[PDB]
Amino acid sequence: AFHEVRFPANLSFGSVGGPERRTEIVTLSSGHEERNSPWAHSRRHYDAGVGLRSLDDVERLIAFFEARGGQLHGFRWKDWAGIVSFNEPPPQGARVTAGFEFDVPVRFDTDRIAVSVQSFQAGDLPQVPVVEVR
Amino acid sequence: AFHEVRFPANLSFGSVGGPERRTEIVTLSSGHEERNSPWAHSRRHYDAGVGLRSLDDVERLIAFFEARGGQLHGFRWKDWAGIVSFNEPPPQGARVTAGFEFDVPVRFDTDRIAVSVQSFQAGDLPQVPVVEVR
Amino acid sequence: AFHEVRFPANLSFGSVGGPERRTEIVTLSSGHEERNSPWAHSRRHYDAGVGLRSLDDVERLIAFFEARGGQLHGFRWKDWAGIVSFNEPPPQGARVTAGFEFDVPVRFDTDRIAVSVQSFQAGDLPQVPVVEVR
Amino acid sequence: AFHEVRFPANLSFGSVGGPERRTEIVTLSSGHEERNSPWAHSRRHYDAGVGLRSLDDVERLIAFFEARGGQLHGFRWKDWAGIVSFNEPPPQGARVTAGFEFDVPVRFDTDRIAVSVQSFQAGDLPQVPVVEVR
Amino acid sequence: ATILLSAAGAAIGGGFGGTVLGLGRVIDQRLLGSGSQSVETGRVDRLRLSSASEGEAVGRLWGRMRVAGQVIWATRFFESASYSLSLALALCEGEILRVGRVWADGSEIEVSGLNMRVYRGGEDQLPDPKIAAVEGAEAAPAYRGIAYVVLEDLQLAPFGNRVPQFTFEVVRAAQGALAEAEPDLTRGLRAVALIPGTGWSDGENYARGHWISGRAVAQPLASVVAEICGAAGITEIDVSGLYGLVRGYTMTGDQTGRAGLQALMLAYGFEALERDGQLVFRMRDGRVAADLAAADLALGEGEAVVETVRAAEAEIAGRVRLAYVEAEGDFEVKAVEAVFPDAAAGAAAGSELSLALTRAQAQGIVGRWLAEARVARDTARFALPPSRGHLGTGDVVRLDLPEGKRRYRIDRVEQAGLIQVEAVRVEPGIYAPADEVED
Amino acid sequence: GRVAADLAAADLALGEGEAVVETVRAAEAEIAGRVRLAYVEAEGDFEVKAVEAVFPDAAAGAAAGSELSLALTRAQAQGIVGRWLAEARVARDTARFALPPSRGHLGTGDVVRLDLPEGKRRYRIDRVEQAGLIQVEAVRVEPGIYAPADEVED
Amino acid sequence: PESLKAHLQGGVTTLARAWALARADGRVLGFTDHDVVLRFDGISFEPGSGMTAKAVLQGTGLSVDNTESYGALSSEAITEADLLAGRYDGAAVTVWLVNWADPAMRAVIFRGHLGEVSRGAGAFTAELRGLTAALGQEQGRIYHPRCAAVLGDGRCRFDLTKDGYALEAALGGVDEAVVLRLAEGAGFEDRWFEKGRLVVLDGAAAGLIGVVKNDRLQADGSRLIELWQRLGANPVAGDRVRIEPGCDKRAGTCRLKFDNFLNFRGFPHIPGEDWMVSYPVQSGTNDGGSLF
Amino acid sequence: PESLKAHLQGGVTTLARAWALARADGRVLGFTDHDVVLRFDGISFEPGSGMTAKAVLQGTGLSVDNTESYGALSSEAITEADLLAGRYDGAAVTVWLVNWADPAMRAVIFRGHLGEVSRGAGAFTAELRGLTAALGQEQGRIYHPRCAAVLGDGRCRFDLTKDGYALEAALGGVDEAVVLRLAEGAGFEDRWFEKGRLVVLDGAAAGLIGVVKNDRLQADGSRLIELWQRLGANPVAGDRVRIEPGCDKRAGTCRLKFDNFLNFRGFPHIPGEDWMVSYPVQSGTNDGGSLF
Amino acid sequence: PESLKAHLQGGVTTLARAWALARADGRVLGFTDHDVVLRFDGISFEPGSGMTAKAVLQGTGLSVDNTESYGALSSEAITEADLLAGRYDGAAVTVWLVNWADPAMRAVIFRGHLGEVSRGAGAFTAELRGLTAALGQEQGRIYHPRCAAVLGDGRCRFDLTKDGYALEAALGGVDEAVVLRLAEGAGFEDRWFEKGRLVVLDGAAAGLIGVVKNDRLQADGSRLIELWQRLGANPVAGDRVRIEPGCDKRAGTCRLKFDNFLNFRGFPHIPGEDWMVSYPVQSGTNDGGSLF
């Protein structure tokens, strides 16, 4: 786990991601249901990042996966979407922030990455999913 | 179960959903077959909601899933489609409304959501399937 | 394992490939989870090469798979993307180069190849996935 | 096995095919690999032939599958791509030719064929894969 | 039309009948390991009785061990006036050495009192005994293979007047084509003499004394396991790595062939390895042949470099038992047990071996099993590449880990071009003499 | 061995395993080289006896015996064990084919001639499972097995 | 592997599987994965058949090893009229793992015994039982009142050619391969050989063993003989058979027909259970005799 | 559940699973699904490991219950050098089903015994045998002529510290964790303790039990002692062991070396089968004696 | 098939499956695949239920045949309040394979016995055990000192109506279908019938058999009787039951209450094991007597 950097600045339009829950459920077949939640929290689970710049940006991006990545390190993630609460219901969010200001430490959900060449200097990679391990 | 709010007002064209019937069935290989249902109601089972507004609407929408949501709470749902009966047959609907005026309390059929950024201010999420648990 | 040649010069736009990490993982259903990798390197795992030239280039390319290929030989691979380190984190890459100057000896990930004729002189083959075996 | 004819002359743009190998492989999980080849040869494995002419050409093509075909006969195959060697590496191809001049005796990889009518006189069939049994 | 829940029926028979075609037991399975299925073996015969029917099978034995025999050709009771018979009791097959120390129903009868004529049962085809000239020469049976003992004018007076159950100490030398090559004592001696003499006495150094009375009978373990595969027909048998003394094993007829051999695999622990077509029977040791590091295993099926299974504590065989035969005195069923001091609270696991061995040796064997069965809790399930395929199916792997460097002997090698292994934990110090005192 | 079917090879249905006739020949190491009984004497003093039949080529092993509690004479017991040792080596071959419901009158115990290009070997059938496609696990049966052995007596 | 480790420790390896089976008849058959015919011994391994080589298993236990060895049957190959008739039963194999670049770099994976062969759909599938197939079987004698051995056996040596005992005559009238007419019936007793070896040494059934029954001569020395079982290959009414004489395996038939009553290996008297629990009553016959 | 039914009958529930295992050593370990560290007893349940909680089964029959309980091994956690050496064997668990909002709303699903633990691929999988594991095992004595009990047992109480019997000395020369040199060999007989408890109470192997063999002192009281089995954790040539004396479990070794021949719990004489069916012959020795 | 081979050898065939089950009560039920109600016998096969007809199996061995026969339960049909109460147990079926164009072209596939019926999810699944279900069961008497037969049995014929033995009275006070008040209790002894047949011949439970216990009359001839088991159908406090008298199956209760001590079919004396191995001591009672 690191505190190394946010990310390369570029993120394409389509960087999707939202919180998860396990919340297993029985669906009582002759009436309503009853369902349990063991989390009290949520994995933010950001997906579908895309790097799109010159090939000068690519070699600092492929080794972003490699050098400080490996598999098992932080690389605090920037959200385009210390405790934050959500007060728009009379309930509350009250979800903690271990890192400062929406920085949500994560890890990539990939055994490999796949960078493509689109033109003499175009570097693309279609997806880098994350799940924000604590 | 809550009585918190309807929803964000915006819903895209394509918000699908219609009643779901157990309809346990035998399918005799001879021919005609019998069947019965144990509900005497119908889960309305609304799907494919889409939030589309600015990013100011997104942070009150992502924590809508989180804060009063979790997984297991009401958030009464607005239908664009106290007891209502349906008299267009000589049979009857006679289906109850626990909440007032088509408000059908539900829950989202998702372990996670997936909000996307499509431009500097565009916030999109493709689907939030519900089932109106009693 | 050979030191025979790089490759035919031509590679189409879309020659994808990036490092692949074992990343053995436990995925505890509680929440956060631990992980470790036994490599201390990363298989570069290049894919989607395409030969596109005249049919004069094809007979030196189909037997490239056959003659020095077979399945189990080197044919040092040219990357369009002696020890190289990656210093953009305070961590390090420090990944070795057995061959000189980005030449990454590989093997094709195919039991067969599939060359197509698209016109009197056009020779195409859609993919030759490699993995850079040491 | 026959020596009957090459084929109908017409072949559409897209007649794909290239050599195969079994070359089973273990991928030693904590380092490099080791892999075996039992062939010393290669099945050329041509696919995706298409007949496209008038319906006068079709009846000499549907019974090409039937009359001298059956299933288990030669019909020497023409390649648009006595021992031929490949000398572009310092290794060698040295692959034999039982038939003369790139004629690669094969068999169709089909239990059935499927000829279509595209217009009053257009005859099409999308694929006839072969593997060149010895 | 659709199929019923005999989809479970066709899953068994013969869905699983094809398996065992091509393939107390409480402690028998752990000692062979994952290994293979331990066949039911050696319910030890106590109260050896002789049944005169026609459905009992021909016994076989190797060395000094009592066998019941059975009646063949008894004449009618003859009253002298107070009875007399002419028995013939057939002990076992093959050429044997002489039968001494006959004791009937009860304690002991002196063989000098009898008129018995022992026979070796020679393939030379010994003629008629001429006591069967009661029958006459024209119908006198002349048994070739079996080693019968006739009895002449036997007075039935001291033991009731009924026929008593006779039991006979028999000495049988191990035979077979591997046995006639490489002769041990029983013909290898070729004249020992040197009778110490020089006359309750000084037998406290008999277990360490140079003289060979009594233990000259006992056949080496090499030829007895060679006799089994010889009788089964495997002449390709390789047995130079075996080092043991048998001292009176006994399996009956129709004892499966292998189930008679499998009792020896519990006592002396040997591999029955079969690297090549030789079927090498080597004695099991801890001599490490592999030295794998953790970096040198292949990618398995379950995508784990080394799956390591530790068995349940509730089933560790806290105390182990035997049912050996006394082998020095009057041959009787005995029992010793080895009890682990920390966990004696349960898990008794005993088995019965029909061979004959002494008193300090039995406590040595059960002391060896209780150590081994707790060592063989750990099993490993890894895959190693065919780059080193010379790991035969019975070798033992050092298997360096980051935490431990624990040895593993291997079983159930299934390769197809990727040698995948079910090992088991084996230490070297298990296979030693226990060095215990005697009775 | 009275044959009721007379199938040619052209007249079998398409089975499950997509083979017209799967033919299994059992292992040589398990053929019951010598067979045994435990009958009762039935003429004299009723006592347990035993006879055995030994095949001359392969006598090297595979003793397979069973015990029948009935009473029968001496030449009959050697007749029975002479019949089993012939039958158990005949019944090594089993066939696993499917025949169409166009001829469903093949009852579960009938015997099929089953003409092949190579052999024309009879087969008695077992384990008929049809559902509208009679699929058969046959077994090889010859007619000459079921005869008196014609042996002398005691 | 035996000193191909220098070849094998390199990742660049080329070991192609190959095996030879020796039938019960003297001929062997060759099989290889290499796709080119190769040989190292005088076997000439053919890639035209055999060889899928699926997953040889092992075990320190006495249980056999197994390999199903999927392949093809053809006229050069096993051809399945050979297999069905009764050959390939105790066929002995050795599987090899040869280097096709240099066939002197090889070893044996196991030497098998090929137990169960399942042929079907124009192919064959043959389970290779391991070295330890013979273990796991019952061998013994049960003191029964007959004999226990075959004629050629060591426990009863006979010199089966010592006189006019064997019937060497060539065959005619094969009919349904159970009835055999035999032109030269005459020369022996009626019902002389009732349990004998019908070894047929010529023609289609070459070296194939059946057992006789119903040795009856109907007219002028015809000697119509049945068999228990079919030969599995049709004799062609010109083959040469030899039939060893029949042994009833009984003391009376032993000593009368044959001289070898000494080498009996049987148990004629064997008193019985009721004798054993009997106590001697002092009435009637209590003098020494046969008890028969 | 015990009076959380008011919480549970509502569909809005939040019961997060959690369990504690108590090792054979006094320490416990904590595990929870809740993803936040919580505790109700002094256990401090950690969500860093453990906890997949797959399908506890039940049965009115004596057969055990089971739960495979997939998880993770780490330095805070089990760490698997602890597990392999011989700990966690008879580890006792309780699985709980706590409310994470209020941990006073909980019950026990079962109290288990954790029989089979299979670790691999950087994780562990541990079958939780049920409460009835001890039933289904054989317990008994078989009248054998040795003793039957251990030294500390109630059937033979000894007061194992009563004199200079135990060897308390600290260890040197651990070598391959089977041979142990022991600096203070001198103080006892040669081959005094041959079946004893090598309890090692310091260092790496803390409270770990092995069994001695080959108690031999080579020079100046070295006392080189072997063991049957490895300790599984290497002692560091500075640890303190104590070795209780060795019992051969025999009447002669009982009364001579130890005083406690009264508490024997063994069966020395036990005449035999041949005595039982013997009828008394009136010859030779028939006066009252030892029969030994 | 029986002479529909002319219909069947043509590829154009139309054989639609159909079967009838005869319940333990006299009524039968009809079932067909044909989708139109058809009949050939007086059964009126209905396609409203039954009939999936999955895979009848066969075997020369004594093992049964089987067919699971998936279908539907409805008010015309089995209706499952009939099935649960105890009917359809030994229900006998015949499966037919009729031509729907001409129902005179039919045969029987098997005649079954319908062993295991599993109903659920608004449907039923009923395993059709084959003809050989009765084989495979243990039948015998074990020389026990009671009787062995039922009252109506051939081994003890009784003429169960011969006097005022049976209690024919109509029922009141059914309560929980175990207690039965019975208005006409009076007419018999207290505790007269303790093992009898409560055949109920009217109303809901029509022809349903239970066994009595606790025949006690509390006041004015009430005769409150329990049963071992529920009838499975509630009697409606107006039904007519008849109760045959109770047999304790003992010699004293045989001859006293009933006259039929001759037809005993039991084994009263049966000395014992200890008698058998006993040798006669010449002390005490050794004169001829009862040994009781």
Ligand code: SF4
């Ligand atoms: S009768 Fe004689 S020759 Fe024939 S089997 Fe018996 S002993 Fe051998």
Ligand code: SF4
């Ligand atoms: S010898 Fe004495 S102290 Fe030792 S185990 Fe036996 S009874 Fe107990």
Ligand code: SF4
């Ligand atoms: S007591 Fe009489 S009537 Fe009753 S069961 Fe016994 S024999 Fe039959």
